[PDB]
Structures are given as structure tokens and as C-alpha cells.
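Forum: Protein Structure Q&A
Topic: Joint prediction for protein chains with partners

I've read a bunch of threads here and the consensus seems to be that you should model interacting components together rather than docking separate models afterwards. I'd like to see that in practice. Below is the full input, 93 residues plus whatever partners are listed. Could one of the regulars post the assembled result?
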Amino acid sequence: RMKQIEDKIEEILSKQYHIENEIARIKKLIG
Amino acid sequence: RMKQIEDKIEEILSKQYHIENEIARIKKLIG
Amino acid sequence: RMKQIEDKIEEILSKQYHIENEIARIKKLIG
Ligand SMILES: [Cl-]
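Posted by a regular:
Agreed with the consensus. Here's the joint model:
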């Protein structure tokens, strides 16, 4: 069960990194 | 304790989905 | 191990709050 939680956290972190990169692109586009 | 962690992960995932939808709207607006 | 998971969740929540604030700024800028 702890491994399943950790795997889900991995997925969340990867998505968060992707979101930050999307935001960086939006800031560049309007910069 | 594991259930509390899992509930918090649920909240994080829901917010992440909301953020992705906000980003999609911003991209549409500037598209 | 549960504490390490909880600490990571703390980091994720803080980053999510930061992302929401970045999005609010972008919405204000294009508003
Ligand atoms: Cl996020």
C-alpha cells in the first residue's frame, strides 16, 4: 500500500513539473 | 494514517486537474 | 516511511499553491 501511494506521488510530481513547464512557455509567449 | 494520506492525494489530484483546465483556458484565450 | 511520504506531500502542496498564484498573475496580466 505504501508503494502504491509512492507511485501516485511520482505521477503527481511528474505532472507538476509538466505544468510548470507549460506555465514557463505561456510566460515566454506573453513576454 | 494511510487513509489520511490517500485523502490528501485525492485533493491534490483534483486540484491538479483544475489547474490543467485553467491552463487550457489560458492557452485557448491567447490562441 | 510515512513521515517521508507526508513531507513530500507538503512539498507538493506548497508547489501547487505557488502554481495557482502564478496562474492568478497570468490571468491578471491578460485581464
Ligand atoms: Cl500541481
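Residues 1-31 of chain B form one domain.
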